[PDB]
């Protein structure tokens, strides 16, 4: 998931927004 | 806080900033 992918790859705004409530 | 590698607590801070009043879910796998 994002926790693993965001450390090894550039995290985007869209990726982050997907985890907002 | 965006368009960079976000390891550990750096991801938590980015979600806090991005999501604002909505809050967020932080879920390691």
Numbering used by the authors:
A (entry chain A): 1 to 21
B (entry chain B): 1 to 29
Anything the authors wrote about it?
Insulin is a two-chain polypeptide, comprising an A chain of 21 residues that includes two α helices (residues A1 to A8 and A12 to A18, respectively), and a B chain of 30 residues that includes a single α helix (residues B9 to B19). Integral to insulin’s structure are its three disulfide bonds — one intra-chain (CysA6-CysA11) and two inter-chain (CysA7-CysB7 and CysA20-CysB19). Insulin binding to the insulin receptor is currently understood to involve the hormone forming a high-affinity cross-link between two distinct sites (1 and 2) on the receptor surface. Here, we specifically seek to explore the influence of the A6-A11 disulfide bond on insulin structure and function through strategic use of olefin metathesis to replace the A6-A11 disulfide bond of insulin with a C=C double bond.
An unsaturated C=C dicarba bond is considerably more rigid than a disulfide bond and adopts either a cis or trans configuration, with an insurmountable barrier to exchange under physiological conditions. The X-ray crystal structures of the cis- and trans isomers were determined using diffraction data to 2.70 Å and 1.55 Å resolution, respectively, with the crystals being grown under similar conditions. The crystal structure of the trans isomer corresponds to a Class 1 insulin conformation. Residues A1-A9 exhibit a classical α-helical geometry, with the azimuthal positioning of residues A1-A5 being closely similar to that of native insulins within Class 1. However, both molecules within the crystallographic asymmetric unit of the trans isomer show an ordered A chain N-terminal helix. Unlike in the structure of the cis isomer, the respective A-chain N-terminal helices of the two trans isomers are involved in crystal contacts, suggesting their crystallographic order may be brought about by these contacts: in solution, the trans isomer A chain is likely disordered. In receptor phosphorylation assays, the cis isomer was equipotent to insulin in activation of IR-B and IR-A, but slightly poorer than insulin in activation of IGF-1R, whereas the trans isomer was ~1000 fold less potent than insulin in activating IR-B. The crystal structure of the trans isomer indicates that it has a Class 1 conformation, and its inactivity suggests that it is incapable of transitioning to a Class 2 structure.
